[PDB]
Amino acid sequence: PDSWDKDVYPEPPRRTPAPAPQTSLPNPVTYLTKIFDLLVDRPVTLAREFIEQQHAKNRYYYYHREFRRVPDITECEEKDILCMFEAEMQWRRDYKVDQEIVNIIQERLKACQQREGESYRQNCAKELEQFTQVSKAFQDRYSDLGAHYSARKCLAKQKQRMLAERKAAKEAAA
Amino acid sequence: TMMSGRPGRVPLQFLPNEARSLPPPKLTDPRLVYMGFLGYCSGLIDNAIRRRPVVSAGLHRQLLYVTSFVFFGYYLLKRQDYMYALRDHDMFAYVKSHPEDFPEKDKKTYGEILEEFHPVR
Ligand SMILES: CCCCCCCCCCCCCCCCC[C@@H](O)O[C@H](CO[C@H](O)CCCCCCCCCCCCCCC)COP(=O)(O)OCC[N+](C)(C)C
Questions:
Q1: What keywords appear on the UniProt entry (chain B) (predicted)?
Q2: What residue numbers bound the domain in which B57 lies?
Q3: Is residue B26 part of a domain?
Protein backbone atom coordinates (compact mmCIF):
# COMPACT_ATOMS: atom_id res chain seq x y z
CA PRO A 1 0.00 0.00 0.00
CA ASP A 2 1.23 3.47 -1.00
CA SER A 3 0.27 4.77 2.46
CA TRP A 4 3.84 4.56 3.78
CA ASP A 5 7.37 4.30 2.41
CA LYS A 6 8.56 0.72 1.98
CA ASP A 7 12.18 1.85 2.29
CA VAL A 8 11.59 3.50 5.67
CA TYR A 9 9.38 0.63 6.91
CA PRO A 10 10.70 -2.48 5.14
CA GLU A 11 9.04 -5.87 5.14
CA PRO A 12 10.42 -9.08 3.61
CA PRO A 13 8.46 -10.67 0.76
CA ARG A 14 5.67 -12.84 2.14
CA ARG A 15 6.05 -16.52 1.24
CA THR A 16 2.68 -18.19 1.80
CA PRO A 17 2.62 -21.93 1.05
CA ALA A 18 -0.12 -23.33 -1.14
CA PRO A 19 -2.66 -25.61 0.57
CA ALA A 20 -2.00 -29.33 0.09
CA PRO A 21 -5.02 -31.12 1.59
CA GLN A 22 -4.86 -34.88 2.11
CA THR A 23 -8.37 -35.59 3.45
CA SER A 24 -11.88 -35.80 2.07
CA LEU A 25 -13.20 -33.95 5.11
CA PRO A 26 -14.34 -30.38 4.38
CA ASN A 27 -12.31 -27.53 5.79
CA PRO A 28 -14.35 -25.59 8.39
CA VAL A 29 -11.84 -22.74 8.18
CA THR A 30 -12.43 -22.46 4.43
CA TYR A 31 -16.21 -22.58 4.84
CA LEU A 32 -16.11 -19.92 7.56
CA THR A 33 -13.78 -17.75 5.48
CA LYS A 34 -16.30 -17.93 2.64
CA ILE A 35 -19.11 -16.98 5.03
CA PHE A 36 -17.04 -14.08 6.38
CA ASP A 37 -16.30 -12.81 2.87
CA LEU A 38 -19.97 -13.01 1.95
CA LEU A 39 -21.42 -11.39 5.08
CA VAL A 40 -18.77 -8.90 6.25
CA ASP A 41 -16.14 -8.12 3.62
CA ARG A 42 -18.61 -7.31 0.83
CA PRO A 43 -20.76 -4.88 2.89
CA VAL A 44 -17.72 -3.11 4.32
CA THR A 45 -16.14 -2.84 0.86
CA LEU A 46 -19.35 -1.36 -0.55
CA ALA A 47 -19.48 1.13 2.32
CA ARG A 48 -15.87 2.16 1.74
CA GLU A 49 -16.51 2.55 -1.98
CA PHE A 50 -19.40 4.91 -1.23
CA ILE A 51 -17.33 6.93 1.26
CA GLU A 52 -14.34 7.14 -1.09
CA GLN A 53 -16.63 8.29 -3.89
CA GLN A 54 -17.88 11.05 -1.60
CA HIS A 55 -14.30 12.00 -0.67
CA ALA A 56 -13.10 12.33 -4.27
CA LYS A 57 -15.69 15.05 -4.94
CA ASN A 58 -14.22 17.25 -2.18
CA ARG A 59 -10.50 16.80 -2.81
CA TYR A 60 -8.22 19.23 -0.98
CA TYR A 61 -4.59 19.21 0.06
CA TYR A 62 -2.42 19.92 3.09
CA TYR A 63 1.30 20.57 3.05
CA HIS A 64 4.36 19.68 5.10
CA ARG A 65 5.98 22.67 6.77
CA GLU A 66 9.56 23.37 5.71
CA PHE A 67 12.06 24.93 8.12
CA ARG A 68 15.24 26.54 6.84
CA ARG A 69 18.49 26.21 8.76
CA VAL A 70 19.68 29.02 11.04
CA PRO A 71 23.02 29.60 12.80
CA ASP A 72 23.52 27.33 15.79
CA ILE A 73 24.62 27.88 19.37
CA THR A 74 28.27 27.35 18.44
CA GLU A 75 28.11 30.39 16.15
CA CYS A 76 25.96 32.46 18.51
CA GLU A 77 27.90 35.02 20.53
CA GLU A 78 27.70 35.03 24.32
CA LYS A 79 24.47 36.50 25.73
CA ASP A 80 23.23 37.39 22.24
CA ILE A 81 19.63 36.64 23.05
CA LEU A 82 18.12 36.58 19.54
CA CYS A 83 20.64 34.23 17.95
CA MET A 84 20.55 32.14 21.12
CA PHE A 85 16.76 31.88 20.83
CA GLU A 86 16.83 30.82 17.19
CA ALA A 87 19.58 28.27 17.85
CA GLU A 88 17.72 26.86 20.86
CA MET A 89 14.52 26.44 18.86
CA GLN A 90 16.42 24.73 16.05
CA TRP A 91 18.11 22.37 18.52
CA ARG A 92 14.73 21.52 20.03
CA ARG A 93 13.29 20.64 16.62
CA ASP A 94 16.32 18.48 15.83
CA TYR A 95 15.91 16.75 19.20
CA LYS A 96 12.31 15.92 18.26
CA VAL A 97 13.35 14.54 14.86
CA ASP A 98 16.03 12.37 16.49
CA GLN A 99 13.49 11.01 18.97
CA GLU A 100 11.23 10.05 16.07
CA ILE A 101 14.12 8.37 14.21
CA VAL A 102 14.75 6.23 17.28
CA ASN A 103 11.02 5.44 17.36
CA ILE A 104 11.13 4.28 13.73
CA ILE A 105 14.07 1.97 14.39
CA GLN A 106 12.31 0.53 17.44
CA GLU A 107 9.21 -0.12 15.34
CA ARG A 108 11.38 -2.00 12.84
CA LEU A 109 12.83 -4.10 15.67
CA LYS A 110 9.45 -5.00 17.18
CA ALA A 111 7.89 -5.86 13.83
CA CYS A 112 10.83 -8.07 12.88
CA GLN A 113 10.68 -9.94 16.19
CA GLN A 114 6.99 -10.70 15.76
CA ARG A 115 7.34 -11.54 12.06
CA GLU A 116 10.22 -13.99 12.45
CA GLY A 117 8.55 -15.69 15.39
CA GLU A 118 10.45 -18.73 16.65
CA SER A 119 13.74 -17.90 14.89
CA TYR A 120 13.94 -14.23 15.83
CA ARG A 121 17.25 -14.51 17.68
CA GLN A 122 19.07 -15.17 14.39
CA ASN A 123 16.79 -13.55 11.81
CA CYS A 124 16.62 -10.15 13.55
CA ALA A 125 20.35 -9.63 14.01
CA LYS A 126 20.44 -6.86 11.38
CA GLU A 127 17.73 -4.86 13.14
CA LEU A 128 19.33 -5.39 16.55
CA GLU A 129 22.69 -3.93 15.49
CA GLN A 130 20.99 -0.95 13.82
CA PHE A 131 18.98 -0.27 16.96
CA THR A 132 22.14 -0.64 19.05
CA GLN A 133 24.00 1.93 16.94
CA VAL A 134 21.13 4.43 16.79
CA SER A 135 20.38 4.13 20.51
CA LYS A 136 24.05 4.48 21.46
CA ALA A 137 24.44 7.65 19.39
CA PHE A 138 21.18 9.08 20.76
CA GLN A 139 22.28 8.28 24.32
CA ASP A 140 25.71 9.86 23.87
CA ARG A 141 24.03 13.00 22.53
CA TYR A 142 21.11 13.46 24.94
CA SER A 143 21.83 11.09 27.81
CA ASP A 144 22.04 13.11 31.04
CA LEU A 145 21.07 16.69 30.25
CA GLY A 146 18.33 16.88 32.90
CA ALA A 147 14.85 18.32 33.01
CA HIS A 148 16.16 21.77 32.01
CA TYR A 149 18.12 20.66 28.96
CA SER A 150 19.36 23.23 26.46
CA ALA A 151 21.63 23.67 23.47
CA ARG A 152 24.25 25.24 25.74
CA LYS A 153 24.23 22.19 28.02
CA CYS A 154 24.48 19.83 25.05
CA LEU A 155 27.35 21.91 23.66
CA ALA A 156 29.15 21.65 27.00
CA LYS A 157 28.59 17.89 27.01
CA GLN A 158 30.00 17.56 23.50
CA LYS A 159 33.01 19.73 24.35
CA GLN A 160 33.68 17.46 27.33
CA ARG A 161 33.43 14.38 25.10
CA MET A 162 35.81 15.94 22.57
CA LEU A 163 38.32 16.78 25.30
CA ALA A 164 38.17 13.22 26.64
CA GLU A 165 38.64 11.74 23.17
CA ARG A 166 41.56 14.06 22.45
CA LYS A 167 43.21 13.08 25.73
CA ALA A 168 42.71 9.37 25.01
CA ALA A 169 44.14 9.78 21.51
CA LYS A 170 47.19 11.60 22.90
CA GLU A 171 47.75 8.86 25.49
CA ALA A 172 47.43 6.15 22.83
CA ALA A 173 49.84 7.99 20.52
CA ALA A 174 52.28 8.47 23.42
CA THR B 1 20.24 61.36 48.26
CA MET B 2 21.24 60.41 44.72
CA MET B 3 19.67 63.07 42.49
CA SER B 4 19.10 65.69 45.18
CA GLY B 5 21.50 68.54 44.53
CA ARG B 6 21.93 67.71 40.86
CA PRO B 7 23.33 70.86 39.19
CA GLY B 8 20.75 73.27 37.85
CA ARG B 9 17.99 72.03 40.15
CA VAL B 10 15.48 74.74 41.09
CA PRO B 11 14.16 74.17 44.63
CA LEU B 12 10.46 73.52 45.20
CA GLN B 13 9.77 73.06 41.47
CA PHE B 14 7.41 70.17 40.78
CA LEU B 15 8.09 70.22 37.04
CA PRO B 16 11.03 72.12 35.55
CA ASN B 17 11.14 73.75 32.13
CA GLU B 18 13.29 70.97 30.65
CA ALA B 19 10.47 68.47 31.21
CA ARG B 20 8.44 70.04 28.38
CA SER B 21 10.53 68.22 25.75
CA LEU B 22 9.22 64.78 26.82
CA PRO B 23 6.06 63.14 25.46
CA PRO B 24 3.18 63.86 27.83
CA PRO B 25 1.19 60.84 29.01
CA LYS B 26 -1.78 59.85 26.90
CA LEU B 27 -5.06 60.64 28.61
CA THR B 28 -6.02 56.95 28.21
CA ASP B 29 -2.92 55.82 30.10
CA PRO B 30 -3.57 52.68 32.17
CA ARG B 31 -1.95 54.45 35.13
CA LEU B 32 -4.40 57.34 34.72
CA VAL B 33 -7.25 54.84 34.51
CA TYR B 34 -6.04 53.25 37.75
CA MET B 35 -5.93 56.66 39.43
CA GLY B 36 -9.53 57.20 38.32
CA PHE B 37 -10.38 53.77 39.73
CA LEU B 38 -8.86 54.80 43.06
CA GLY B 39 -11.05 57.90 43.01
CA TYR B 40 -14.14 55.81 42.33
CA CYS B 41 -13.26 53.45 45.18
CA SER B 42 -12.83 56.43 47.50
CA GLY B 43 -16.28 57.68 46.50
CA LEU B 44 -17.90 54.31 47.17
CA ILE B 45 -16.17 54.09 50.55
CA ASP B 46 -17.41 57.60 51.35
CA ASN B 47 -21.00 56.57 50.63
CA ALA B 48 -20.61 53.38 52.65
CA ILE B 49 -19.12 55.15 55.68
CA ARG B 50 -21.79 57.86 55.63
CA ARG B 51 -24.52 55.20 55.19
CA ARG B 52 -25.82 56.44 51.85
CA PRO B 53 -26.69 54.06 49.00
CA VAL B 54 -23.22 53.09 47.84
CA VAL B 55 -23.60 53.09 44.06
CA SER B 56 -26.49 55.54 43.64
CA ALA B 57 -26.10 58.45 46.06
CA GLY B 58 -23.75 61.38 45.59
CA LEU B 59 -23.08 61.13 41.87
CA HIS B 60 -21.63 64.65 41.84
CA ARG B 61 -19.37 63.76 44.78
CA GLN B 62 -18.17 60.58 43.07
CA LEU B 63 -17.46 62.55 39.91
CA LEU B 64 -15.38 65.02 41.92
CA TYR B 65 -13.40 62.17 43.50
CA VAL B 66 -12.61 60.62 40.13
CA THR B 67 -11.72 63.95 38.53
CA SER B 68 -9.38 64.99 41.34
CA PHE B 69 -7.57 61.66 41.24
CA VAL B 70 -7.15 61.78 37.46
CA PHE B 71 -5.85 65.37 37.64
CA PHE B 72 -3.23 64.68 40.30
CA GLY B 73 -2.30 61.38 38.67
CA TYR B 74 -1.62 63.12 35.36
CA TYR B 75 0.79 65.56 36.96
CA LEU B 76 2.40 62.83 39.08
CA LEU B 77 2.98 60.69 35.98
CA LYS B 78 4.62 63.64 34.23
CA ARG B 79 7.02 64.17 37.14
CA GLN B 80 7.80 60.44 37.38
CA ASP B 81 8.58 60.21 33.67
CA TYR B 82 10.77 63.30 33.87
CA MET B 83 12.80 61.87 36.76
CA TYR B 84 13.35 58.57 34.96
CA ALA B 85 14.42 60.34 31.76
CA LEU B 86 16.85 62.41 33.84
CA ARG B 87 18.30 59.28 35.45
CA ASP B 88 18.88 57.60 32.10
CA HIS B 89 20.41 60.79 30.68
CA ASP B 90 22.88 61.06 33.57
CA MET B 91 23.80 57.37 33.40
CA PHE B 92 24.46 57.46 29.66
CA ALA B 93 26.54 60.63 29.98
CA TYR B 94 28.67 59.14 32.75
CA VAL B 95 29.28 55.94 30.78
CA LYS B 96 30.29 58.02 27.76
CA SER B 97 32.63 60.17 29.87
CA HIS B 98 34.33 57.20 31.61
CA PRO B 99 35.34 54.76 28.85
CA GLU B 100 38.16 53.30 30.95
CA ASP B 101 35.56 52.36 33.57
CA PHE B 102 33.00 51.03 31.05
CA PRO B 103 35.08 49.26 28.40
CA GLU B 104 33.72 47.40 25.42
CA LYS B 105 34.64 43.73 25.68
CA ASP B 106 35.36 41.48 22.71
CA LYS B 107 32.51 39.06 22.09
CA LYS B 108 33.36 35.35 22.11
CA THR B 109 31.03 32.72 20.69
CA TYR B 110 29.86 29.63 22.53
CA GLY B 111 32.06 27.61 20.19
CA GLU B 112 35.05 29.28 21.85
CA ILE B 113 33.72 29.55 25.41
CA LEU B 114 34.31 26.41 27.48
CA GLU B 115 31.69 25.55 30.11
CA GLU B 116 31.81 22.71 32.61
CA PHE B 117 29.13 20.08 32.01
CA HIS B 118 27.23 18.81 35.05
CA PRO B 119 25.25 15.64 34.26
CA VAL B 120 21.89 15.10 35.94
CA ARG B 121 21.68 11.45 36.96
C1 LIG C 1 -7.42 69.53 42.69
C2 LIG C 1 -6.56 68.48 41.99
C3 LIG C 1 -6.07 67.44 43.03
C4 LIG C 1 -5.07 68.11 43.99
C5 LIG C 1 -4.78 67.18 45.17
C6 LIG C 1 -3.47 67.64 45.85
C7 LIG C 1 -2.94 66.53 46.78
C8 LIG C 1 -1.39 66.47 46.69
C9 LIG C 1 -0.80 67.88 46.96
C10 LIG C 1 0.41 68.14 46.03
C11 LIG C 1 1.71 67.55 46.67
C12 LIG C 1 2.93 68.00 45.83
C13 LIG C 1 3.04 69.55 45.87
C14 LIG C 1 3.25 70.08 44.44
C15 LIG C 1 3.87 71.52 44.51
C16 LIG C 1 5.17 71.49 45.38
C17 LIG C 1 6.43 71.38 44.47
C18 LIG C 1 7.53 70.57 45.19
O19 LIG C 1 7.10 70.24 46.47
O20 LIG C 1 7.78 69.40 44.46
C21 LIG C 1 9.04 68.79 44.64
C22 LIG C 1 8.97 67.81 45.81
O23 LIG C 1 7.66 67.25 45.85
C24 LIG C 1 7.58 66.02 46.53
O25 LIG C 1 8.80 65.72 47.11
C26 LIG C 1 7.19 64.91 45.54
C27 LIG C 1 5.66 65.00 45.24
C28 LIG C 1 5.11 63.59 44.87
C29 LIG C 1 4.64 62.87 46.17
C30 LIG C 1 3.33 62.08 45.87
C31 LIG C 1 3.68 60.67 45.33
C32 LIG C 1 4.46 59.87 46.42
C33 LIG C 1 4.88 58.48 45.83
C34 LIG C 1 3.84 57.40 46.27
C35 LIG C 1 3.85 56.24 45.23
C36 LIG C 1 2.59 55.35 45.42
C37 LIG C 1 1.34 56.23 45.52
C38 LIG C 1 1.01 56.84 44.15
C39 LIG C 1 0.08 58.04 44.35
C40 LIG C 1 -1.35 57.55 44.61
C41 LIG C 1 10.13 69.83 44.90
O42 LIG C 1 11.38 69.19 45.01
P43 LIG C 1 12.40 69.72 46.21
O44 LIG C 1 12.00 71.02 46.72
O45 LIG C 1 13.73 70.02 45.68
O46 LIG C 1 12.46 68.61 47.43
C47 LIG C 1 13.48 68.74 48.42
C48 LIG C 1 13.48 67.52 49.37
N49 LIG C 1 13.95 66.29 48.69
C50 LIG C 1 14.90 66.60 47.65
C51 LIG C 1 14.58 65.44 49.65
C52 LIG C 1 12.82 65.60 48.13
A1: Electron transport, Membrane, Mitochondrion, Mitochondrion inner membrane, Respiratory chain, Transmembrane, Transmembrane helix, Transport, Ubiquinone
A2: 1-98
A3: yes
